[PDB]
């Protein structure tokens, strides 16, 4: 699809057998999901943004279905206010900006 | 232009007679610029994101030239780590997401 930006670019995703809504975020290097039940091992990590840093859990090779496109990659889980699909997954679904 | 997301979508902007680089950020409702010398009055404001909240100064009707497209709107100035062009200005230059 083509998506204009008058509203937040939210899409439905399926991850870990669960359905969530997430923001397509060209300003996010990484994908960061609200606290949720993901299976497997992980590695602690810190990420920064506006207002400071948060500790997250880093899961690799996680399958996400993003508005019907499948992608595999790193997903961070932690105290984010909104589910964020970052560039590590946006490139996998062929997402571009256009103006 | 069409912009892929393998790298940060940075563009050159001109604001207040100054040249800066800024991130085209579909995940940002607002435009937030690193501390910089803007003229005029303002109103204090708080914004939130990953890692918490920051206080910014809100300037309205600011002219920004974003990769050669002119836009006028609200610009926030404060302790952001990166210059962010948010959706309030992205809609004005006709920016879309495509996948
Ligand atoms: C490294 O991997 C990451 C890092 C951060 C995030 C969370 N992100 C993505 C938002 O693009 C961003 C922009 C931003 C990103 C990095 C950074 F160092 C500084 C800023 C943002 C900007 C403005 C607004 S606002 C107040 O206008 O709504 C909201 C969000 C943010 O904080 C995810 C992954």
Secondary structure: elements and pairs:
The structure is a homodimer of 99-residue chains.
Chain A: E1 2-3, E2 10-15, E3 18-24, E4 32-33, E5 43-49, E6 52-66, E7 69-77, E8 84-85, H1 87-90, E9 96-98
Parallel strand pairs in A: 3-8, 4-7
Antiparallel strand pairs in A: 2-3, 2-6, 5-6, 6-7
Bound molecules: the ligand COc1ccc(CN2C[C@H](O)[C@@](Cc3ccc(F)cc3)(c3ccc(S(C)(=O)=O)cc3)C2=O)cc1.
Organism (chains A, B): Human immunodeficiency virus type 1 (HIV-1)
Subcellular location (chains A, B): Host endosome, Host multivesicular body; Virion membrane
GO cellular component, one term (chains A, B): host multivesicular body
Give a quick rundown of the structure:
Chains A, B: It is found in: Host endosome, Host multivesicular body; Virion membrane. The structure is a homodimer of 99-residue chains. With 99 residues, chain A is mainly β.
């Amino acid at each position: 699809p083509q998506i204009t930006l008058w509203q937040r670019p939210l899409v439905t995703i399926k991850i870990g057998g669960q359905l969530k809504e997430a923001l397509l975020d060209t300003g996010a290097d990484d994908t960061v999901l609200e606290e949720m039940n993901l299976p497997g091992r992980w590695k602690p990590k810190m990420i920064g943004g506006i207002g400071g840093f948060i500790k997250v859990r880093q899961y690799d090779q996680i399958l996400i279905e993003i508005c019907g496109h499948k992608a595999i990659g790193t997903v961070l889980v932690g105290p984010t206010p909104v589910n964020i699909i970052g560039r590590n997954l946006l490139t996998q679904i062929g997402c571009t900006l256009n103006f």
